[PDB]
Amino acid sequence: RKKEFIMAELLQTEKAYVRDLHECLETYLWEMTSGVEEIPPGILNKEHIIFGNIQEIYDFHNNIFLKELEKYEQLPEDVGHCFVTWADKFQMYVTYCKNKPDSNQLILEHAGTFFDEIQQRHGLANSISSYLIKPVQRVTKYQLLLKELLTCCEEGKGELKDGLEVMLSVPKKANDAMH
């Protein structure tokens, strides 16, 4: 039961993460790249700084990682393997976190209410800043879910320990890369 509630959260919060990144790309990013609205010169053509590599992280989760977690739904005690299999892909969270302070500064100093205006228009509960912390949140959150699985999975639990090792290591490497 506990292992089942945890896997179900892993899956449900994964779906919502993908949804949230998707929203972010096809609103806050799409306004800027479209050319349908007045873009402050201070942020113009700096969408790579604002959003960092969030497209690539979205593509990972949307094309692969959510499809593969789904396949571990009835195999919670093995889901650590999923993170080992895709370990190199999570290296892009290092890149994302390195860039987040530069993204925050940029939005503060040079974007005015550009994005506030878009939020209001589209009727979004989440600010662009809310969306843009999500990758940071998500990448620290996986190791919580794995620890929870360790508290309720038996001697078939190297198929978690190694998953966890990886998902402890990605955020530490992101943490260790900041100025």
Add this chain to the structure above:
Amino acid sequence: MQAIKCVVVGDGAVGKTCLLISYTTNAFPGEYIPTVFDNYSANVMVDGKPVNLGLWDTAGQEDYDRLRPLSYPQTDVFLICFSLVSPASFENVRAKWYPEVRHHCPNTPIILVGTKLDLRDDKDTIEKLKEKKLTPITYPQGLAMAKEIGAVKYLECSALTQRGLKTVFDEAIRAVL
């Protein structure tokens, strides 16, 4: 209408996630405690003025000293938390949480919240602590800590019983108005 960013910080032992879930859903989560509380916003009226209240969890980030501050900028108020039945979390208010919050947000109001009020009178919890030559944290300990860090209020709450829980967040709001 006024938008309020509220970030909840503190040790894993406070039950940040549980606190926010139990606040927003008006009920202790019960059987299973979820590890994930996604950034929240909802309308509440406080002293007759309606407000949009933003809530950001920080659980999972406790070992990443340079990742946590990514959430800090533009915050309107902090809940710095400790569990009333972990002296270590309480000491960490001083040692870890208040320092990094003042460094990054020097003029942002803090509420000091003691969680797990329901466990302060629990024999088994009391006993487990007495075996480590410790006791729970009492009211004047909170007051003294609040003062030391410059908190606008010290409040005690339980996610389990809902005692003090609505008030925590009301006062978070009042400290911004």
